[PDB]
Amino acid sequence: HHHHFNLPPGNYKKPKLLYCSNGGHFLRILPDGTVDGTRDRSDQHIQFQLSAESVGEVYIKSTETGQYLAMDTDGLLYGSQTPNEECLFLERLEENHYNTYISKKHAEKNWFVGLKKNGSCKRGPRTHYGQKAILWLPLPV
């Protein structure tokens, strides 16, 4: 392992919203596969169903479009129609409170799922431990 194994409490029984502490945005995957953040709580594309592959490994799937959150070879997030190796994330506790999601594929590079204060996605290499951009709070739908 290249990372710790402090896991967050909670389960995957129900869908959730993923709120980024940084700019207070909800993660969003639009129909065309575009990923970004929005403050609009009434958005129909901010609801996600998380599921565990192995302990601590998860898929993040849009309940509205069925698209899986994924990070490509150059670190950009995108919505995938089918589950693949780029869709697996290491879900961990951070700052004893928040949830972080590390690309499994690029875990050695410490590429995280994260949003900038303006709600745009951070590219893998631009993320790192210590940033507010990578801190998530899972909320009930």
> What's the rounded Cα separation, in Å, for the pair 128 and 96?
17
> What's the rounded Cα separation, in Å, for the pair 28 and 43?
8
> What's the rounded Cα separation, in Å, for the pair 21 and 115?
9
> What's the rounded Cα separation, in Å, for the pair 135 and 44?
22
Domain spans, the chain: 1-141
> What's the rounded Cα separation, in Å, for the pair 61 and 68?
4
For 1-141, the fitting CATH number among 1.20.1070.10, 3.40.50.720, 2.80.10.50, 3.30.565.10 is 2.80.10.50
Binding region: 22
Binding region for heparin: 22
Q: How was this structure determined?
A: X-ray
